[PDB]
Amino acid sequence: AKSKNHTTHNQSRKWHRNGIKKPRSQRYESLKGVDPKFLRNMRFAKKHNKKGLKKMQANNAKAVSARA
RNA sequence: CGGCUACCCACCCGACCCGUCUUGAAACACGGACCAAGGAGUCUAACACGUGCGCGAGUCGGGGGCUCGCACGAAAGCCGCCGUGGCGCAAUGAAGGUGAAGGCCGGCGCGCUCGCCGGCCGAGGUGGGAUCCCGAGGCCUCUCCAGUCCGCCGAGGGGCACCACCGGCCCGUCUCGCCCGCCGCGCCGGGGAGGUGGAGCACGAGCGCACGUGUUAGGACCCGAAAGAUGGUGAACUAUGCCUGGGCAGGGCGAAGCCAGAGGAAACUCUGGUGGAGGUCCGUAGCGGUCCUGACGUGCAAAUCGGUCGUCCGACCUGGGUAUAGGGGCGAAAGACUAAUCGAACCAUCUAGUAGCUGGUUCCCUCCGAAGUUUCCCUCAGGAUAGCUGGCGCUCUCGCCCACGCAGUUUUAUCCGGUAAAGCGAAUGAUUAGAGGUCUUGGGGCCGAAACGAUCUCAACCUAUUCUCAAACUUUAAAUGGGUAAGAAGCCCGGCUCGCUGGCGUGGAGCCGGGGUGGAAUGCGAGUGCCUAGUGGGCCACUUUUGGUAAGCAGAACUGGCGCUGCGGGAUGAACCGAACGCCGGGUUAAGGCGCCCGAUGCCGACGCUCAUCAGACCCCAGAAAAGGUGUUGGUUGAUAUAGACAGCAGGACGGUGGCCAUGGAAGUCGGAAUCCGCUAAGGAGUGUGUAACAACUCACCUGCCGAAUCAACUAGCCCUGAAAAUGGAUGGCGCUGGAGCGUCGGGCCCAUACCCGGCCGUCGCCGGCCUACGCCGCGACGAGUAGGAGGGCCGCUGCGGUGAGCCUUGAAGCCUAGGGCGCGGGCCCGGGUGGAGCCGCCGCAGGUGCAGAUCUUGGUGGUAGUAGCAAAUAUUCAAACGAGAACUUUGAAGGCCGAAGUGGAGAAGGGUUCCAUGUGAACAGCAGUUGAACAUGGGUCAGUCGGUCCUGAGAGAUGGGCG
RNA sequence: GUACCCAUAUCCGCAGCAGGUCUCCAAGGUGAACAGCCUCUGGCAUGUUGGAACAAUGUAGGUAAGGGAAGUCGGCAAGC
RNA sequence: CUGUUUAAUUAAAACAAAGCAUCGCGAAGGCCCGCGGCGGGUGUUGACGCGAUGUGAUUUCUGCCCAGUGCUCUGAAUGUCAAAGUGAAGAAAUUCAAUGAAGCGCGGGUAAACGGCGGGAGUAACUAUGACUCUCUUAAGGUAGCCAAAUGCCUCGUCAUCUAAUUAGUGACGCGCAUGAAUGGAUGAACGAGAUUCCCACUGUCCCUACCUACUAUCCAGCGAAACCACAGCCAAGGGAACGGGCUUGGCGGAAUCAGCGGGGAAAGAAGACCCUGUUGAGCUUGACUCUAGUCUGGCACGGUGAAGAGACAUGAGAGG
RNA sequence: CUUCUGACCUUUUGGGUUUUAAGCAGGAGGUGUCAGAAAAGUUACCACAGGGAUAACUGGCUUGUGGCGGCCAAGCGUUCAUAGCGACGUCGCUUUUUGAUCCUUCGAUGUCGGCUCUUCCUAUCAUUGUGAAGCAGAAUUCGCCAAGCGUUGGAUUGUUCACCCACUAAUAGGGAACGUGAGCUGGGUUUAGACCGUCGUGAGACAGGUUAGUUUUACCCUACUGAUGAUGUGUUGUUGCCAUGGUAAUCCUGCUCAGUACGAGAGGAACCGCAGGUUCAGACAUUUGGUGUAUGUGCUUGGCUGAGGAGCCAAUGGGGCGAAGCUACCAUCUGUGGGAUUAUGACUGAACGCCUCUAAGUCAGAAUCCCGCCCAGGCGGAACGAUACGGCAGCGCCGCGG
Ligand SMILES: [Mg+2]
Ligand SMILES: [Mg+2]
Ligand SMILES: [Mg+2]
Ligand SMILES: [Mg+2]
Ligand SMILES: [Mg+2]
Ligand SMILES: [Mg+2]
Ligand SMILES: [Mg+2]
Ligand SMILES: [Mg+2]
Ligand SMILES: [Mg+2]
Ligand SMILES: [Mg+2]
Ligand SMILES: [Mg+2]
Ligand SMILES: [Mg+2]
Ligand SMILES: [Mg+2]
Ligand SMILES: [Mg+2]
Ligand SMILES: [Mg+2]
Ligand SMILES: [Mg+2]
Ligand SMILES: [Mg+2]
Ligand SMILES: [Mg+2]
Ligand SMILES: [Mg+2]
Ligand SMILES: [Mg+2]
Ligand SMILES: [Mg+2]
Ligand SMILES: [Mg+2]
Ligand SMILES: [Mg+2]
Ligand SMILES: [Mg+2]
Ligand SMILES: [Mg+2]
Ligand SMILES: [Mg+2]
Ligand SMILES: [Mg+2]
Ligand SMILES: [Mg+2]
Ligand SMILES: [Mg+2]
Ligand SMILES: [Mg+2]
Ligand SMILES: [Mg+2]
Ligand SMILES: [Mg+2]
Ligand SMILES: [Mg+2]
Ligand SMILES: [Mg+2]
Ligand SMILES: [Mg+2]
Ligand SMILES: [Mg+2]
Ligand SMILES: [Mg+2]
Ligand SMILES: [Mg+2]
Ligand SMILES: [Mg+2]
Ligand SMILES: [Mg+2]
Ligand SMILES: [Mg+2]
Ligand SMILES: [Mg+2]
Ligand SMILES: [Mg+2]
Ligand SMILES: [Mg+2]
Ligand SMILES: [Mg+2]
Ligand SMILES: [Mg+2]
Ligand SMILES: [Mg+2]
Ligand SMILES: [Mg+2]
Ligand SMILES: [Mg+2]
Ligand SMILES: [Mg+2]
Ligand SMILES: [Mg+2]
Ligand SMILES: [Mg+2]
Ligand SMILES: [Mg+2]
Ligand SMILES: [Mg+2]
Ligand SMILES: [Mg+2]
Ligand SMILES: [Mg+2]
Ligand SMILES: [Mg+2]
Ligand SMILES: [Mg+2]
Ligand SMILES: [Mg+2]
Ligand SMILES: [Mg+2]
Ligand SMILES: [Mg+2]
Ligand SMILES: [Mg+2]
Ligand SMILES: [Mg+2]
Ligand SMILES: [Mg+2]
Ligand SMILES: [Mg+2]
Ligand SMILES: [Mg+2]
Ligand SMILES: [Mg+2]
Ligand SMILES: [Mg+2]
Ligand SMILES: [Mg+2]
Ligand SMILES: [Mg+2]
Ligand SMILES: [Mg+2]
Ligand SMILES: [Mg+2]
Ligand SMILES: [Mg+2]
Ligand SMILES: [Mg+2]
Ligand SMILES: [Mg+2]
Ligand SMILES: [Mg+2]
Ligand SMILES: [Mg+2]
Ligand SMILES: [Mg+2]
Ligand SMILES: [Mg+2]
Ligand SMILES: [Mg+2]
Ligand SMILES: [Mg+2]
Ligand SMILES: [Mg+2]
Ligand SMILES: [Mg+2]
Ligand SMILES: [Mg+2]
Ligand SMILES: [Mg+2]
Ligand SMILES: [Mg+2]
Ligand SMILES: [Mg+2]
Ligand SMILES: [Mg+2]
Ligand SMILES: [Mg+2]
Ligand SMILES: [Mg+2]
Ligand SMILES: [Mg+2]
Ligand SMILES: [Mg+2]
Ligand SMILES: [Mg+2]
Ligand SMILES: [Mg+2]
Ligand SMILES: [Mg+2]
Ligand SMILES: [Mg+2]
Ligand SMILES: [Mg+2]
Ligand SMILES: [Mg+2]
Ligand SMILES: [Mg+2]
Ligand SMILES: [Mg+2]
Ligand SMILES: [Mg+2]
Ligand SMILES: [Mg+2]
Ligand SMILES: [Mg+2]
Ligand SMILES: [Mg+2]
Ligand SMILES: [Mg+2]
Ligand SMILES: [Mg+2]
Ligand SMILES: [Mg+2]
Ligand SMILES: [Mg+2]
Ligand SMILES: [Mg+2]
Ligand SMILES: [Mg+2]
Ligand SMILES: [Mg+2]
Ligand SMILES: [Mg+2]
Ligand SMILES: [Mg+2]
Ligand SMILES: [Mg+2]
Ligand SMILES: [Mg+2]
Ligand SMILES: [Mg+2]
Ligand SMILES: [Mg+2]
Ligand SMILES: [Mg+2]
Ligand SMILES: [Mg+2]
Ligand SMILES: [Mg+2]
Ligand SMILES: [Mg+2]
Ligand SMILES: [Mg+2]
Ligand SMILES: [Mg+2]
Ligand SMILES: [Mg+2]
Ligand SMILES: [Mg+2]
Ligand SMILES: [Mg+2]
Ligand SMILES: [Mg+2]
Ligand SMILES: [Mg+2]
Ligand SMILES: [Mg+2]
Ligand SMILES: [Mg+2]
Ligand SMILES: [Mg+2]
Ligand SMILES: [Mg+2]
Ligand SMILES: [Mg+2]
Ligand SMILES: [Mg+2]
Ligand SMILES: [Mg+2]
Ligand SMILES: [Mg+2]
Secondary structure (H helix, E strand, O other): OOOOOOOOOOOOOHHHHHOOOOOOOOOOOOOOOOOHHHHHHHHHHHOOOOHHHHHHHHHHHHHHHOOO
């Protein structure tokens, strides 16, 4: 009882009925697969930022506000 | 007079018989003779999602108890120190076990890749984010003054839910090291910084009840097996033993034994009788069944009958009793018989056994609407997964010089590739021929004792060319096609963090802060979550292609179509050409067509081709080739002709030379090579016929007459030959020839459910109004559809709780009806006629709720059809009586059959009143009946000496005892 | 217990079914004979119906001139 | 040979038969029944008997192979080998070791047990074929017989007879795909409701059909079904699920009927006995898988007393390398 | 599941130690049907649910193969390509062979061959009319229009096929579901019994061979054959036409021609005419033969009526003859012509000064076509006769008014 083996007929119609839209592009996609050393350095820079940010950046903001 | 309709008839057009398996159904595929009733997705437990309700970090009394005995009460009410308990509120490890709060500010110890302290609120930050808040600005009678009065908005802020990311916390692990504590200073505990695994935490949402869908276990939508197990019943048929009885006409052959006679010296032999044996022969009764493959073959018969057969003293046939009973018995063995069933009986139960397999599966309308494909499976007639589909939503966006976002598309930049084509005087592999050079090699000829001492040639090698090819070759290389980008998620500027890297404040990432959106065209509203049926056999077509000679063959790529689909043309039709579908009126048209079927050329239509004794007449499509035509109609390349051709008529057609090679003959004429010469006006060492050769005819050539065009080869349009198949017959038919054929066209005309305008119905979107708000309006765009998914029903059936101060013996339900009428529809209302005691509307509730099929179950009725059939065994007739009725009864007579192995007289088994008498004649008797073995009534079986009872036979059987 | 059928009509086979079912008695003629045929004692209406005709086909039965198996797979049937 | 056989498609060459052979058994036995018992059949039996097989009148013949598969017999010389029993290590569970019943393995016998019986090369004064000989193989290479057979593919083999003509029949030939010796081979009087060939007489089997008789069939009187039925029935061509009756184009088309007929209705009788699928069954067989009755051995109790003897363990002592 | 490796790890259940076991992580022991069950064969004694998703029939698509043709022309043909063949190449038709695919058929289409019978096809074996030869005659070979008429009797085989004998003008090829099984036959294939050979340990298998092996139903519709009828002409009858459909004739022998034409001989025709015969068709019974139940007559076996005489019975007792009727190629009679034309041969005659059967026009022309003869006569019509007593009637024609 030989039958049909494999065809791709009437497949593009099934695909285009729902759509072949591109994947959802969003900001801050992901951080997976990134170098572990680079990720560790980024975490350290993010967690040590508020130590010196809230003072020197505030002083510079006051200075630029006095400038303009 | 008006009247649609469930009345009948006629014409015009269209019209194949329904249901399901299938790519394909009206099929010469299956089911259906018809009608009435019954008939198929239910219920329980569990799970998932969605919706309604109540409570809410809680929720739930379903389990019990309490009040008072109760028709409604197997209800309802309550427990409150009955919440035991289930679910959720805490997760992570196999386990010992552990087990979730961040942020700001300042200080100190080296504010150290650095802990602690003190104060506060208290679940971080970034980019989006409905909504809300603030808000420059301008919008209302003459004016500076105002609170309401008119009234939107640039920009900015805190930001629900939700989305993405970063960080934070908990549990199990791996690396690194250091610190703290002691009910006891230890292979005792606790803590940190980094990478990972968790169904986690990071202000919680679950619980209980009901409904709908989907999956699953229950017989589980309905009907259906071959089979398996348990426990019992059959030897009245048949197979076999045993016991006890019965039966087998007549003839033929002539075994042993016996007697007599004859022959012989003896042994002995021979002859004629008698004798009556045989698993003997012909043959009857009996027992079986060879052939006619005879008759029947819905029969006499679920195995028979007529001839013809084999055996008939036996291994014979047969009655009764008795023993063996189902994986068993019995078997002169055919797996035959075992109660019409035997390669494993019957009966009841498990059992509604299972089926990936057939068949069926019941009311209407509206909306949406496929797949035969990927992967896996002992998978290929199936299932799971993905995909296609539907439903429920949810989050936002427009609606009062500018949008977020998207696209089977184009435009601009940008790469990617190795097909089509082309090439091999370019790589690789195949490949024909020529030209030159030869270093060498091999085969021939030459000078000559031989010799790379010399020479000619061939093969081989090299060089520059040359002809033809590669899906598994390629320098080069298309079209088509694939990806990306065309902004605010971007750019410029400044400053902080890094434990990453490092000459360097170097590089790179992260964060913060203020300033500047108009960035290719066109079109469009987008995003997202959950549940989910069906599908998982396909087919066809333009083009590209694999195997095959080819196929209406098998297998692929894109797109379209059928299946899932009607309509107008192709006469006919699955795929072709147009075109897609609510009900209508008008106009137009696509494809196609205008001689009649059949609507339209019935145009004073145009140009040209074509004649068939087989014309021709429209993609798929239903017919044909190589080749040929002095049949016509066009074209090309050429050659001749007033220095008079081509055709026709007439004349010449000679000499060297009967030339050289041949020979039985070649003297132009069978052959090989050649092939000239001289006078001429021209004659060819000769185009053909003929002779064995010579002769003869004739031709090339020249000339005489006529007199102006002609000859030859190819090429392509119609037509013709090529062209033969079986029932009579297919441009669709009739037919058509100044066309109704072929080619090129013009102006009109014909009609589709297509287009435009308008009415009506429904869906969707936008909405409008403070008029059943679940109602009433307005505008616009769309309506097909199998499998399947949803919504509505004031469609229908049954019963229950309310309600209609409901209808009815002045007529309920039901049934019938050329009557009226409503709704698109399921259906319903009224009138009339039967009928004689119940029924219905509205609001909710629960179903054993809708039939056209299932070789569906039961019951009834048709065509067949007053048909087949009342024919195995020789045969009936006359008169009379009883009777309404005579062929079937009775009596008499005549003619016949069974003819003693009977169609007679008696019995055993079996039947049980069938035996007898009387009486009726609807039923029985296959017609009839006065008749009967039918019906009703009443009678009938008399035993010491007929048999049972008595006795044992094969055999069955209790106690003693044994086993269980 | 004692009737009756004991059967092509009282049994079984779905029935008044050419089927099946165990025994006794059994004459005369022809003839070897209980073969076949014809009669007597004893039974019967021809087997679930009759009338009219004698077409084809059919079911059983018998002949056919000349040939004699030449038909057929086979001398099947029929025939001697 | 007589006889029996598939009731209801077979009557036979099949089965059976006397005869001829072989196997087991001396009763605490052989072959079987049985859930059970020292229960039952043979057995009211005892080797001229019982039980289990093969071949199949009489005569003559019974060839060669034990390699394999089966059957049987032997020695605790000899390998494998379960429970139970013994010793050792360990606190014990446990582990190790010594020995080891049947069976298997080894060896012998048996083929009237199942079965089998090959293949090359050189050699005769016409040549070939071939008297004769060498060689591989395993256990032995078809002996005596018989044949194109009921056994032969080539084949309708070749020759002779039978015929006018023969794929038939008979006789003979014989590297015979693939005959053959109790798998029985060769004959063979009588008898086959056995199959086949020829001949004589015979006849309607036929040339070549015709006629006659009885019962139907036929019409009528009376009585009266069933099978089947989607609706129903005139054809040609085309398309179509590729062979229509209904569709399209044409040919055409008057009621109701009787007697035959068998071309059609792809006629009826039955969910194809043929082929395939089923993760559907049943019968049967075996060196398919897993089990079991039964059967053969070993151990444990029933199961008790005496004597003699062998092997090992522990004990003290004397020889040895 | 087993084994190994590591923690100076976890649990070994009332609490401790130890053996052991379980537990975590990763390496190995395998699913070759490789996303992974543990698995021999036969059933012809077979069964069930299904499949035309899937073979054995036919039909359908193509024709490789088979058969049948055409073109080119190297050559055969003594000479000479094409009288007759024609290689190397190449182009077509057919489904009378086989093969390829599986489209309809699995709730069945009865599947070989033979017998009987009808029709059709032509790629013609013979017959009618013709052309060409290496056609002197005869016998032959190649084509043209041509299917009207024939294409037999047997030996062996189941056979399709094939071979042989004989006859004949010739013994040609096919189709219709490989025509035809509710027509037959069952010889083989293809069930169940059994035998032999080979294969298999076995059950069993063999497109190997040999034997015996149930052949069911029509009464329905149509078609066909025949018979009543129906429609319309007012009724009925007689005499008549045919529109239409069917269609029948075919072949051979002997004699005169003629031992002639022809041919050197050997050999050896043809036209007209005369006798017939084969097959087929229509009938017919005087003669001949069949049948026979006038149960006509006369013998004869057994029994029966007492015996003669007369008879009867024995499923028409047998047999010798036989009227009438039916019947036989087993006897007898008969079977017939006109037209237009095909193939072909010709006339006049241009295209194309000539030629030419053609281009327009003419001629002859046949088993083929049609009709004539014959068969039945239509939802076809004509010509003629009679047309309703009896007592009241009834029915026609003319003229009529309502
Ligand atoms: Mg598939
Ligand atoms: Mg239905
Ligand atoms: Mg199916
Ligand atoms: Mg199909
Ligand atoms: Mg259908
Ligand atoms: Mg059908
Ligand atoms: Mg059918
Ligand atoms: Mg039916
Ligand atoms: Mg109903
Ligand atoms: Mg609690
Ligand atoms: Mg069942
Ligand atoms: Mg089982
Ligand atoms: Mg039992
Ligand atoms: Mg008995
Ligand atoms: Mg005898
Ligand atoms: Mg004899
Ligand atoms: Mg007899
Ligand atoms: Mg019989
Ligand atoms: Mg019998
Ligand atoms: Mg027989
Ligand atoms: Mg018969
Ligand atoms: Mg009959
Ligand atoms: Mg007899
Ligand atoms: Mg005899
Ligand atoms: Mg006898
Ligand atoms: Mg059993
Ligand atoms: Mg039986
Ligand atoms: Mg059983
Ligand atoms: Mg069920
Ligand atoms: Mg599949
Ligand atoms: Mg979706
Ligand atoms: Mg490529
Ligand atoms: Mg290329
Ligand atoms: Mg296919
Ligand atoms: Mg295809
Ligand atoms: Mg479908
Ligand atoms: Mg669609
Ligand atoms: Mg469509
Ligand atoms: Mg159409
Ligand atoms: Mg197009
Ligand atoms: Mg289109
Ligand atoms: Mg319109
Ligand atoms: Mg048009
Ligand atoms: Mg018109
Ligand atoms: Mg043509
Ligand atoms: Mg067409
Ligand atoms: Mg076609
Ligand atoms: Mg031309
Ligand atoms: Mg025509
Ligand atoms: Mg529309
Ligand atoms: Mg719709
Ligand atoms: Mg109601
Ligand atoms: Mg009343
Ligand atoms: Mg009442
Ligand atoms: Mg119901
Ligand atoms: Mg119904
Ligand atoms: Mg039914
Ligand atoms: Mg009733
Ligand atoms: Mg009826
Ligand atoms: Mg009748
Ligand atoms: Mg009868
Ligand atoms: Mg009277
Ligand atoms: Mg009487
Ligand atoms: Mg008498
Ligand atoms: Mg007697
Ligand atoms: Mg008697
Ligand atoms: Mg009475
Ligand atoms: Mg009666
Ligand atoms: Mg009585
Ligand atoms: Mg009574
Ligand atoms: Mg007395
Ligand atoms: Mg007594
Ligand atoms: Mg007892
Ligand atoms: Mg006791
Ligand atoms: Mg009595
Ligand atoms: Mg009887
Ligand atoms: Mg009887
Ligand atoms: Mg006598
Ligand atoms: Mg006498
Ligand atoms: Mg009578
Ligand atoms: Mg009777
Ligand atoms: Mg005769
Ligand atoms: Mg005679
Ligand atoms: Mg004779
Ligand atoms: Mg003879
Ligand atoms: Mg024969
Ligand atoms: Mg006979
Ligand atoms: Mg017997
Ligand atoms: Mg028989
Ligand atoms: Mg014993
Ligand atoms: Mg013997
Ligand atoms: Mg031997
Ligand atoms: Mg041995
Ligand atoms: Mg032990
Ligand atoms: Mg020699
Ligand atoms: Mg030999
Ligand atoms: Mg012999
Ligand atoms: Mg013969
Ligand atoms: Mg052998
Ligand atoms: Mg041999
Ligand atoms: Mg005679
Ligand atoms: Mg037709
Ligand atoms: Mg056909
Ligand atoms: Mg057709
Ligand atoms: Mg039909
Ligand atoms: Mg119609
Ligand atoms: Mg139609
Ligand atoms: Mg009739
Ligand atoms: Mg008939
Ligand atoms: Mg079936
Ligand atoms: Mg499967
Ligand atoms: Mg079975
Ligand atoms: Mg796999
Ligand atoms: Mg099996
Ligand atoms: Mg058998
Ligand atoms: Mg198919
Ligand atoms: Mg087929
Ligand atoms: Mg049938
Ligand atoms: Mg049929
Ligand atoms: Mg003819
Ligand atoms: Mg046929
Ligand atoms: Mg046979
Ligand atoms: Mg057989
Ligand atoms: Mg002469
Ligand atoms: Mg002469
Ligand atoms: Mg005749
Ligand atoms: Mg006569
Ligand atoms: Mg006569
Ligand atoms: Mg007489
Ligand atoms: Mg007499
Ligand atoms: Mg007398
Ligand atoms: Mg008699
Ligand atoms: Mg007579
Ligand atoms: Mg006579
Ligand atoms: Mg005649
Ligand atoms: Mg002519």
